[PDB]
Amino acid sequence: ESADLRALAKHLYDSYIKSFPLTKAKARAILTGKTTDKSPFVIYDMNSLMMGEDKIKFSKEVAIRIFQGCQFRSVEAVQEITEYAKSIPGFVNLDLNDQVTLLKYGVHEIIYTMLASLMNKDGVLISEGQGFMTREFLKSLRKPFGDFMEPKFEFAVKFNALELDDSDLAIFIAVIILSGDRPGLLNVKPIEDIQDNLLQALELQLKLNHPESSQLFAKLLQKMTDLRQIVTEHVQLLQVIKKTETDMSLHPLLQEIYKDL
Ligand SMILES: CC1(COc2ccc(CC3=[SH]C(=O)NC3=O)cc2)CCCCC1
């Protein structure tokens, strides 16, 4: 019955809002500076970056500070995602070692999915939207850290072209966690039973919310290829900073879900 799917769709969107402080709705409202009830401070070089603290709650180089921000932002999102994931029906019932494995492997694909909500083609919101750092300022950093964000902007523009809203994303990111082809899953079939369910919810949720978009379902499922390549590119980048920056700490949670290859 499609009516139970809808009850599932509503439950997830509700836990989504409850787990993530900055929705896509709030982000698009900040970004279209026609809604100027709260406008972002814009960082665009190092001058802007320095004044961004006379204004915003924010000798140790800048590209690394930039990056250990992106680091501890990633910690932030992982804890919001694991909280969101507990709320997915059946997920907390699963073998504990497999809870950990869906999370290990689904979380980064989910940071970059949601990173798109914060993104347009010129930059990305910062500190839960108070600030907005340009895409070029990012591109300009010290020669290694000078391109880590660049494949996110690449995916985000093409992903944001589908124009999903949060009530669509909440079901999509659930599908991502509940994959079943993650490495090392002891019992995968109950995982596939839940995802069959999430897929059905997602399919009819897109069908009802975007009824002029033939096969948005097929086209949204394809973008899962782009997340996998973002994650690999990122882990490769990550290793170069390790060696060419032996003074560069990394958070052990991030360090923990990063078991490479
Ligand atoms: C991480 C962003 C936005 O979110 C940020 C928040 C804060 C800082 C700066 C910080 S956070 C800290 O603990 N110390 C700092 O110097 C940087 C970024 C999203 C991903 C793309 C790059 C930017």
mmCIF file of C-alpha atoms and ligand atoms in Angstrom:
data_model
loop_
_atom_site.group_PDB
_atom_site.id
_atom_site.type_symbol
_atom_site.label_atom_id
_atom_site.label_comp_id
_atom_site.label_asym_id
_atom_site.label_seq_id
_atom_site.Cartn_x
_atom_site.Cartn_y
_atom_site.Cartn_z
ATOM 1 C CA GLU A 1 0.000 0.000 0.000
ATOM 2 C CA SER A 2 1.367 3.360 -1.115
ATOM 3 C CA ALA A 3 -0.257 4.868 2.014
ATOM 4 C CA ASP A 4 2.324 3.226 4.279
ATOM 5 C CA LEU A 5 5.132 4.483 2.120
ATOM 6 C CA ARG A 6 3.787 8.025 2.684
ATOM 7 C CA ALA A 7 3.815 7.421 6.454
ATOM 8 C CA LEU A 8 7.471 6.376 6.069
ATOM 9 C CA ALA A 9 8.315 9.397 3.879
ATOM 10 C CA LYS A 10 6.838 11.714 6.491
ATOM 11 C CA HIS A 11 8.653 9.997 9.350
ATOM 12 C CA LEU A 12 12.052 10.353 7.665
ATOM 13 C CA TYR A 13 11.652 14.028 6.594
ATOM 14 C CA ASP A 14 10.686 14.748 10.204
ATOM 15 C CA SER A 15 13.791 13.043 11.611
ATOM 16 C CA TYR A 16 15.849 14.733 8.875
ATOM 17 C CA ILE A 17 14.733 18.200 9.998
ATOM 18 C CA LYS A 18 15.270 17.145 13.635
ATOM 19 C CA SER A 19 18.861 15.918 12.953
ATOM 20 C CA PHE A 20 20.304 18.589 10.622
ATOM 21 C CA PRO A 21 20.195 22.297 11.707
ATOM 22 C CA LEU A 22 20.686 23.797 8.257
ATOM 23 C CA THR A 23 18.138 22.433 5.754
ATOM 24 C CA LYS A 24 18.312 23.016 1.994
ATOM 25 C CA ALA A 25 15.271 25.271 2.433
ATOM 26 C CA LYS A 26 17.099 27.578 4.827
ATOM 27 C CA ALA A 27 20.198 27.416 2.594
ATOM 28 C CA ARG A 28 18.372 28.403 -0.612
ATOM 29 C CA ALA A 29 16.701 31.202 1.342
ATOM 30 C CA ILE A 30 20.080 32.608 2.425
ATOM 31 C CA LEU A 31 21.628 32.104 -0.992
ATOM 32 C CA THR A 32 18.927 33.900 -2.981
ATOM 33 C CA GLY A 33 19.781 37.255 -1.445
ATOM 34 C CA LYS A 34 16.266 38.379 -2.306
ATOM 35 C CA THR A 35 15.422 36.960 1.164
ATOM 36 C CA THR A 36 17.437 39.454 3.171
ATOM 37 C CA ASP A 37 16.108 38.742 6.668
ATOM 38 C CA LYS A 38 19.638 37.333 7.337
ATOM 39 C CA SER A 39 22.427 37.758 4.698
ATOM 40 C CA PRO A 40 25.825 35.898 4.688
ATOM 41 C CA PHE A 41 29.194 37.556 5.087
ATOM 42 C CA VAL A 42 31.246 36.702 2.021
ATOM 43 C CA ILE A 43 34.870 35.551 2.238
ATOM 44 C CA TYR A 44 36.703 36.086 -1.071
ATOM 45 C CA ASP A 45 40.473 36.311 -0.350
ATOM 46 C CA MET A 46 42.527 36.809 2.779
ATOM 47 C CA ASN A 47 41.351 40.328 3.489
ATOM 48 C CA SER A 48 37.748 39.158 3.703
ATOM 49 C CA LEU A 49 38.779 36.101 5.713
ATOM 50 C CA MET A 50 40.399 38.336 8.389
ATOM 51 C CA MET A 51 37.375 40.621 8.832
ATOM 52 C CA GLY A 52 35.061 37.590 8.906
ATOM 53 C CA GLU A 53 35.614 37.554 12.691
ATOM 54 C CA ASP A 54 34.859 41.156 13.538
ATOM 55 C CA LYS A 55 31.511 39.848 12.172
ATOM 56 C CA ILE A 56 31.154 36.031 12.548
ATOM 57 C CA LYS A 57 32.024 33.610 15.339
ATOM 58 C CA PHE A 58 35.175 31.999 13.880
ATOM 59 C CA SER A 59 51.640 31.611 12.684
ATOM 60 C CA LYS A 60 49.447 28.649 11.603
ATOM 61 C CA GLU A 61 48.963 28.891 7.804
ATOM 62 C CA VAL A 62 45.577 29.695 6.210
ATOM 63 C CA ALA A 63 44.949 26.802 3.799
ATOM 64 C CA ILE A 64 45.409 24.358 6.685
ATOM 65 C CA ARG A 65 43.029 26.289 8.978
ATOM 66 C CA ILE A 66 40.566 26.320 6.052
ATOM 67 C CA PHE A 67 40.930 22.550 5.889
ATOM 68 C CA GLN A 68 40.762 21.615 9.555
ATOM 69 C CA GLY A 69 37.552 23.608 9.440
ATOM 70 C CA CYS A 70 36.357 21.331 6.639
ATOM 71 C CA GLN A 71 37.686 18.577 8.911
ATOM 72 C CA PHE A 72 35.687 19.368 12.033
ATOM 73 C CA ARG A 73 32.719 20.268 9.864
ATOM 74 C CA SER A 74 32.952 16.678 8.630
ATOM 75 C CA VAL A 75 32.882 15.462 12.239
ATOM 76 C CA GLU A 76 29.771 17.603 12.791
ATOM 77 C CA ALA A 77 28.001 16.019 9.809
ATOM 78 C CA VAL A 78 28.973 12.468 10.724
ATOM 79 C CA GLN A 79 27.378 12.790 14.164
ATOM 80 C CA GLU A 80 24.238 14.321 12.645
ATOM 81 C CA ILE A 81 24.121 11.466 10.134
ATOM 82 C CA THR A 82 24.533 8.717 12.737
ATOM 83 C CA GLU A 83 21.746 10.379 14.695
ATOM 84 C CA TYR A 84 19.638 10.563 11.553
ATOM 85 C CA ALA A 85 20.443 6.887 10.809
ATOM 86 C CA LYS A 86 19.225 5.563 14.182
ATOM 87 C CA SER A 87 15.799 6.866 13.148
ATOM 88 C CA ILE A 88 15.617 4.752 9.964
ATOM 89 C CA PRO A 89 13.187 1.839 10.637
ATOM 90 C CA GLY A 90 15.045 -1.412 11.233
ATOM 91 C CA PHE A 91 18.497 0.170 11.050
ATOM 92 C CA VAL A 92 19.116 -0.004 14.808
ATOM 93 C CA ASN A 93 17.818 -3.618 14.839
ATOM 94 C CA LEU A 94 20.698 -4.755 12.676
ATOM 95 C CA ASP A 95 23.906 -6.524 13.678
ATOM 96 C CA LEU A 96 26.006 -3.936 15.487
ATOM 97 C CA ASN A 97 29.052 -4.635 13.321
ATOM 98 C CA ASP A 98 26.845 -3.899 10.290
ATOM 99 C CA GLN A 99 25.402 -0.710 11.754
ATOM 100 C CA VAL A 100 29.019 0.443 11.910
ATOM 101 C CA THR A 101 29.703 -0.633 8.338
ATOM 102 C CA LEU A 102 26.796 1.082 6.618
ATOM 103 C CA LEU A 103 27.885 4.213 8.503
ATOM 104 C CA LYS A 104 31.636 3.938 7.783
ATOM 105 C CA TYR A 105 30.889 3.754 4.038
ATOM 106 C CA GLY A 106 27.699 5.736 3.551
ATOM 107 C CA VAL A 107 28.555 8.804 5.571
ATOM 108 C CA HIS A 108 30.856 10.576 3.115
ATOM 109 C CA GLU A 109 28.556 10.034 0.164
ATOM 110 C CA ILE A 110 25.976 11.731 2.422
ATOM 111 C CA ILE A 111 28.133 14.704 3.425
ATOM 112 C CA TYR A 112 28.647 15.502 -0.256
ATOM 113 C CA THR A 113 24.987 14.949 -1.181
ATOM 114 C CA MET A 114 24.028 17.474 1.512
ATOM 115 C CA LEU A 115 27.045 19.687 0.771
ATOM 116 C CA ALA A 116 25.265 20.393 -2.537
ATOM 117 C CA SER A 117 22.381 21.991 -0.662
ATOM 118 C CA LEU A 118 24.873 24.564 0.688
ATOM 119 C CA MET A 119 26.381 25.190 -2.708
ATOM 120 C CA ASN A 120 25.947 27.190 -5.803
ATOM 121 C CA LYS A 121 28.536 27.695 -8.544
ATOM 122 C CA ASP A 122 30.363 30.525 -6.725
ATOM 123 C CA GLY A 123 30.828 29.110 -3.227
ATOM 124 C CA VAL A 124 29.358 27.379 -0.211
ATOM 125 C CA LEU A 125 27.832 28.450 3.091
ATOM 126 C CA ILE A 126 29.999 28.387 6.226
ATOM 127 C CA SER A 127 29.311 28.120 9.973
ATOM 128 C CA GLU A 128 25.665 27.132 9.455
ATOM 129 C CA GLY A 129 25.172 29.821 6.859
ATOM 130 C CA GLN A 130 26.549 32.921 8.647
ATOM 131 C CA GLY A 131 29.241 33.195 5.995
ATOM 132 C CA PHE A 132 29.818 32.270 2.364
ATOM 133 C CA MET A 133 33.266 31.475 0.975
ATOM 134 C CA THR A 134 33.743 31.870 -2.773
ATOM 135 C CA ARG A 135 34.661 28.923 -5.012
ATOM 136 C CA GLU A 136 37.684 30.813 -6.399
ATOM 137 C CA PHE A 137 39.135 31.771 -3.003
ATOM 138 C CA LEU A 138 39.026 28.015 -2.349
ATOM 139 C CA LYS A 139 40.734 27.271 -5.673
ATOM 140 C CA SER A 140 43.521 29.764 -4.822
ATOM 141 C CA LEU A 141 44.919 28.053 -1.735
ATOM 142 C CA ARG A 142 48.421 26.557 -1.256
ATOM 143 C CA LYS A 143 49.099 24.211 -4.126
ATOM 144 C CA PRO A 144 47.879 20.907 -2.565
ATOM 145 C CA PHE A 145 44.825 22.140 -0.576
ATOM 146 C CA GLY A 146 44.046 24.180 -3.720
ATOM 147 C CA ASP A 147 41.609 21.746 -5.294
ATOM 148 C CA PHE A 148 39.997 19.591 -2.571
ATOM 149 C CA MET A 149 36.663 21.423 -2.740
ATOM 150 C CA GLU A 150 36.718 21.609 -6.532
ATOM 151 C CA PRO A 151 35.128 18.158 -7.291
ATOM 152 C CA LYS A 152 32.326 18.974 -4.787
ATOM 153 C CA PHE A 153 31.329 22.111 -6.717
ATOM 154 C CA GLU A 154 31.495 19.943 -9.826
ATOM 155 C CA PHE A 155 28.940 17.433 -8.567
ATOM 156 C CA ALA A 156 26.852 19.989 -6.689
ATOM 157 C CA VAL A 157 25.947 22.134 -9.716
ATOM 158 C CA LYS A 158 24.866 19.107 -11.721
ATOM 159 C CA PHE A 159 23.145 17.563 -8.703
ATOM 160 C CA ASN A 160 21.266 20.743 -7.735
ATOM 161 C CA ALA A 161 19.908 20.760 -11.304
ATOM 162 C CA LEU A 162 17.439 18.038 -10.285
ATOM 163 C CA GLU A 163 15.978 20.556 -7.734
ATOM 164 C CA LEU A 164 15.170 18.181 -4.928
ATOM 165 C CA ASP A 165 13.787 19.536 -1.685
ATOM 166 C CA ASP A 166 14.513 18.213 1.798
ATOM 167 C CA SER A 167 11.505 15.902 1.790
ATOM 168 C CA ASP A 168 13.075 14.221 -1.253
ATOM 169 C CA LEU A 169 16.625 14.229 0.125
ATOM 170 C CA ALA A 170 15.647 12.650 3.438
ATOM 171 C CA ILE A 171 14.520 9.492 1.648
ATOM 172 C CA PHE A 172 17.470 9.541 -0.765
ATOM 173 C CA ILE A 173 20.079 9.764 2.020
ATOM 174 C CA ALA A 174 18.344 6.871 3.817
ATOM 175 C CA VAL A 175 18.742 4.752 0.643
ATOM 176 C CA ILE A 176 22.443 5.655 0.646
ATOM 177 C CA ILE A 177 23.074 4.364 4.167
ATOM 178 C CA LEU A 178 21.109 1.154 3.624
ATOM 179 C CA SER A 179 23.121 -0.119 0.669
ATOM 180 C CA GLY A 180 24.113 -3.737 1.267
ATOM 181 C CA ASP A 181 27.054 -3.773 -1.179
ATOM 182 C CA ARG A 182 29.277 -2.168 1.428
ATOM 183 C CA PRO A 183 32.413 -4.244 2.156
ATOM 184 C CA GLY A 184 32.177 -6.669 5.037
ATOM 185 C CA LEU A 185 28.464 -6.802 5.793
ATOM 186 C CA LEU A 186 27.761 -9.968 7.766
ATOM 187 C CA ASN A 187 24.034 -10.214 7.055
ATOM 188 C CA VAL A 188 23.129 -8.167 3.993
ATOM 189 C CA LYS A 189 19.679 -9.455 3.099
ATOM 190 C CA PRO A 190 17.782 -7.694 5.914
ATOM 191 C CA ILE A 191 19.706 -4.573 4.880
ATOM 192 C CA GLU A 192 18.372 -5.103 1.352
ATOM 193 C CA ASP A 193 14.866 -5.606 2.765
ATOM 194 C CA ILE A 194 14.881 -2.180 4.392
ATOM 195 C CA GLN A 195 16.350 -0.537 1.280
ATOM 196 C CA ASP A 196 13.750 -2.125 -0.985
ATOM 197 C CA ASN A 197 11.311 -0.312 1.294
ATOM 198 C CA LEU A 198 13.134 3.042 1.231
ATOM 199 C CA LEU A 199 13.431 2.780 -2.556
ATOM 200 C CA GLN A 200 9.632 2.339 -2.867
ATOM 201 C CA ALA A 201 9.060 5.337 -0.584
ATOM 202 C CA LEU A 202 11.549 7.443 -2.596
ATOM 203 C CA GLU A 203 10.077 6.360 -5.950
ATOM 204 C CA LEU A 204 6.531 7.441 -5.049
ATOM 205 C CA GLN A 205 7.779 10.490 -3.154
ATOM 206 C CA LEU A 206 9.465 11.812 -6.289
ATOM 207 C CA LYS A 207 6.480 10.749 -8.374
ATOM 208 C CA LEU A 208 4.066 12.841 -6.228
ATOM 209 C CA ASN A 209 6.362 15.800 -5.466
ATOM 210 C CA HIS A 210 7.919 16.168 -8.984
ATOM 211 C CA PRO A 211 5.181 14.911 -11.341
ATOM 212 C CA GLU A 212 6.580 16.740 -14.407
ATOM 213 C CA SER A 213 9.996 15.082 -14.052
ATOM 214 C CA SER A 214 9.931 11.868 -16.055
ATOM 215 C CA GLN A 215 12.270 9.350 -14.410
ATOM 216 C CA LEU A 216 13.741 11.631 -11.728
ATOM 217 C CA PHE A 217 14.068 8.348 -9.795
ATOM 218 C CA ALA A 218 16.358 6.802 -12.415
ATOM 219 C CA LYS A 219 18.291 10.064 -12.675
ATOM 220 C CA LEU A 220 18.695 10.499 -8.929
ATOM 221 C CA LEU A 221 19.899 6.899 -8.497
ATOM 222 C CA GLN A 222 22.541 7.480 -11.207
ATOM 223 C CA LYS A 223 24.122 10.333 -9.253
ATOM 224 C CA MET A 224 25.287 7.712 -6.755
ATOM 225 C CA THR A 225 28.138 7.106 -9.211
ATOM 226 C CA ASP A 226 29.372 10.654 -8.667
ATOM 227 C CA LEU A 227 29.464 10.370 -4.901
ATOM 228 C CA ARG A 228 31.703 7.280 -5.041
ATOM 229 C CA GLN A 229 34.271 9.129 -7.197
ATOM 230 C CA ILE A 230 34.199 12.210 -4.946
ATOM 231 C CA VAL A 231 34.956 10.001 -1.934
ATOM 232 C CA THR A 232 37.916 8.252 -3.628
ATOM 233 C CA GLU A 233 39.369 11.492 -4.977
ATOM 234 C CA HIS A 234 39.097 12.906 -1.491
ATOM 235 C CA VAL A 235 40.856 9.985 0.209
ATOM 236 C CA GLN A 236 43.706 10.235 -2.302
ATOM 237 C CA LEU A 237 44.027 13.956 -1.639
ATOM 238 C CA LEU A 238 43.868 13.107 2.055
ATOM 239 C CA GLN A 239 46.994 10.960 1.919
ATOM 240 C CA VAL A 240 49.138 13.616 0.244
ATOM 241 C CA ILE A 241 48.350 16.089 3.047
ATOM 242 C CA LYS A 242 49.247 13.322 5.548
ATOM 243 C CA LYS A 243 52.844 12.999 4.261
ATOM 244 C CA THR A 244 53.472 16.584 2.963
ATOM 245 C CA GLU A 245 52.060 17.817 6.237
ATOM 246 C CA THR A 246 53.182 15.442 8.976
ATOM 247 C CA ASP A 247 52.265 18.316 11.376
ATOM 248 C CA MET A 248 48.632 18.041 10.333
ATOM 249 C CA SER A 249 46.366 16.344 12.836
ATOM 250 C CA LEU A 250 43.154 14.657 11.790
ATOM 251 C CA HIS A 251 40.152 13.777 13.937
ATOM 252 C CA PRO A 252 40.268 10.084 14.962
ATOM 253 C CA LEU A 253 36.592 9.552 14.096
ATOM 254 C CA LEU A 254 37.374 10.770 10.555
ATOM 255 C CA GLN A 255 40.622 8.836 10.851
ATOM 256 C CA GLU A 256 38.466 5.837 11.935
ATOM 257 C CA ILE A 257 35.981 5.725 9.020
ATOM 258 C CA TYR A 258 38.968 6.376 6.739
ATOM 259 C CA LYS A 259 40.294 2.852 6.288
ATOM 260 C CA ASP A 260 41.591 3.528 2.788
ATOM 261 C CA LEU A 261 41.207 1.682 -0.570
HETATM 262 C C1 LIG B 1 33.969 23.595 6.213
HETATM 263 C C2 LIG B 1 33.198 24.435 5.241
HETATM 264 C C3 LIG B 1 32.366 25.465 6.024
HETATM 265 O O1 LIG B 1 32.407 25.355 7.409
HETATM 266 C C4 LIG B 1 33.488 25.939 8.060
HETATM 267 C C5 LIG B 1 33.332 26.389 9.353
HETATM 268 C C6 LIG B 1 34.417 26.951 9.997
HETATM 269 C C7 LIG B 1 35.637 27.066 9.356
HETATM 270 C C8 LIG B 1 36.845 27.672 10.054
HETATM 271 C C9 LIG B 1 37.159 26.982 11.395
HETATM 272 S S1 LIG B 1 36.217 25.889 12.265
HETATM 273 C C10 LIG B 1 37.279 25.648 13.549
HETATM 274 O O2 LIG B 1 37.116 24.837 14.675
HETATM 275 N N1 LIG B 1 38.345 26.390 13.317
HETATM 276 C C11 LIG B 1 38.314 27.114 12.191
HETATM 277 O O3 LIG B 1 39.399 27.911 11.892
HETATM 278 C C12 LIG B 1 35.769 26.630 8.064
HETATM 279 C C13 LIG B 1 34.699 26.060 7.423
HETATM 280 C C14 LIG B 1 32.289 23.524 4.450
HETATM 281 C C15 LIG B 1 33.126 22.595 3.623
HETATM 282 C C16 LIG B 1 33.859 23.397 2.589
HETATM 283 C C17 LIG B 1 34.852 24.313 3.255
HETATM 284 C C18 LIG B 1 34.175 25.158 4.321
#
